Every structure is written in C-alpha cells, then in structure tokens.
Design a protein around this ligand. Structure first.
Ligand code: MDI
Length: 244
C-alpha cells in the first residue's frame, strides 16, 4: 500500500519488455508492471520460488512487482566486449540454469523457449530463468525459435521436459561461444532436413571435451534417453569443480 515507490516516467530496458517501470520496494530496487500474464507469476500467487528462477516479489493494490536484474539478457552480457567472463564463470552460468530448470521440471512445468536471451543476470552475478508467456504447467500429463527446438517438437508440435533438455544443450553452446548464433548458414525452414542429415552443432574453441559430450547427450535422437536436469546438475558440478 505505502511500501511501493513507482517511477512511471522511467521504464526498464528501453521498452524491450513493454511498459515495465523502475520501482523501490520497502530499499529494494525492483521492476513494476500494471490473466494473459506469465504462468510462473500466477503460480507464485496461488501456489513456487527458486534462486535461479525469475519470480514474483509481490502484488500491490494492480501492480505486479518482480526483482530488478542489472543485466536483462544473458546473451547480451556474454556478447558485450567490456565483460570478460572466464570458462569457469560461463560453465557456472549454465549450472545455475540447470538448477532453475531442475526445480521447474519438479513442478511439472515446460519452458518451451529456453535460450540465453531469456535468462537474466543481477549485480551479484546470479542467473535467473525468465518466462515471457510460453511456459506451461503440464499438471498430471507428461507433455504439453526453431534452432533451439528438439527434433521431435519440430515434427509434432509437442513439448516435454526432454525437449527443454535439448534446448539446454544449445544454451550451453551459446555460453561456450559467448553469444554466437547457432547454425549461422542454415535457414529456419530446412532445420529438420539439416538435422536428419546426421548433424549437430560443432564443438566450440574453449568448450572442454567433457562439456561437449554433455551437449551431445542433450541432443540424443531419443528423448527418453536424454539426461534429466538432476543428472545435468550432477555432471556439470563435477566439470566446474575441475577449474580453479
Ligand atoms: C509482469 C512482468 C513484470 C516485470 C518483468 C521484468 C522485466 C524485465 C526485468 C529486468 C531487466 N529486471 N527485472 C525485470 C522484470 C516481466 C514481467 C513479464 N510479463 C510481461 C508478464 O508476465 C506478462 N504480463 C502481462 C501480459 C503478458 C505477460 C507475459 F506473459 F507475456 C514476465 C517477465 C518480464
């Protein structure tokens, strides 16, 4: 009621997220917006919270308040030449995404657009998985940006947690290339054809061999054979621990 100062003359991220304003919650910096909303927000009201997931701070009377993220796009952050993240930091960012995804999958939620441009970074360098309206609760069922999509989703329009695992592999690839575009010489229509030819993304220059074998496991032709986000958190923790 009297615990929110809202700056209606100051929008976050130059309009790239719509009308979202700078706020101060009683002093915490925040993002303020005024049923079509993200399902993670409706879950945080009715049900749901994780440090690696961008979620609701609260509701004010309506005013939907989320926390402020200094770097609203992880893809932009790793692509900016003023930042020089190490191979250990980039693997660390991926481990955080896998932690948020392991949590969301336990909640039976399917993201459907897991990419580095849909992850945010704050001032303490903590990564959060954001949803812009595409994630769905799968409830009791086990199913519900073509270059990040799994082969069985391109062919059938059905999404499962294992199709998110495929996208996580492309996110890992984006991380090791510091924001390079996947399949740069391929058109989005012939992606299914390009893949069915027996192809996958090439191993980047600074991607350690054990991390590339993990990306290949994520892109396994059979969805049921892909590792879970628990196995990915386990496997990536070990690789990360080998670096000083
Ligand atoms: C409501 C809201 C408040 C703050 C943000 C935000 C943005 C940037 C930053 C940054 C850079 N830091 N913190 C931030 C917070 C966002 C939302 C978003 N959103 C618009 C909705 O859920 C939504 N609302 C109405 C209609 C449809 C939808 C959606 F489903 F399409 C979800 C993620 C972005």
């Amino acid at each position: 009621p009297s615990s929110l100062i809202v700056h209606f003359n100051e929008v976050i991220g130059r309009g790239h997220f719509g009308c979202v304003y700078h706020g101060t919650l009683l002093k915490i910096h925040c993002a303020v917006k005024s049923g079509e909303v993200s399902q993670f927000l409706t879950e945080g009201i009715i049900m749901f919270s994780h440090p690696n997931v961008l979620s609701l701070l609260g509701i004010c009377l309506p005013l939907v308040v989320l926390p402020y993220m200094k770097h609203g796009d992880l893809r932009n952050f790793i692509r900016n030449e003023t930042h020089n993240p190490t191979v250990k930091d980039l693997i660390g960012f991926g481990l955080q995404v896998a932690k948020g995804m392991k949590y969301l999958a336990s909640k039976k939620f399917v993201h459907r657009d897991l990419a580095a441009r849909n992850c945010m970074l704050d001032e303490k360098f903590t990564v959060k998985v954001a949803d812009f309206g595409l994630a769905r609760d799968m409830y009791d069922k086990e199913y519900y940006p073509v270059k990040w999509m799994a082969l069985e989703s391109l062919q059938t329009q059905k999404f499962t947690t294992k199709s998110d695992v495929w996208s996580f592999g492309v996110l890992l690839w984006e991380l090791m290339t510091r924001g390079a575009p996947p399949y740069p010489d391929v058109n989005t229509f012939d992606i299914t054809v390009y893949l069915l030819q027996g192809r996958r993304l090439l191993q980047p220059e600074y991607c350690p061999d054990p991390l590339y074998e993990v990306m290949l496991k994520c892109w396994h032709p059979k969805a049921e054979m892909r590792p879970s986000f628990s196995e990915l958190v386990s496997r990536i923790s070990a690789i990360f621990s080998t670096f000083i």
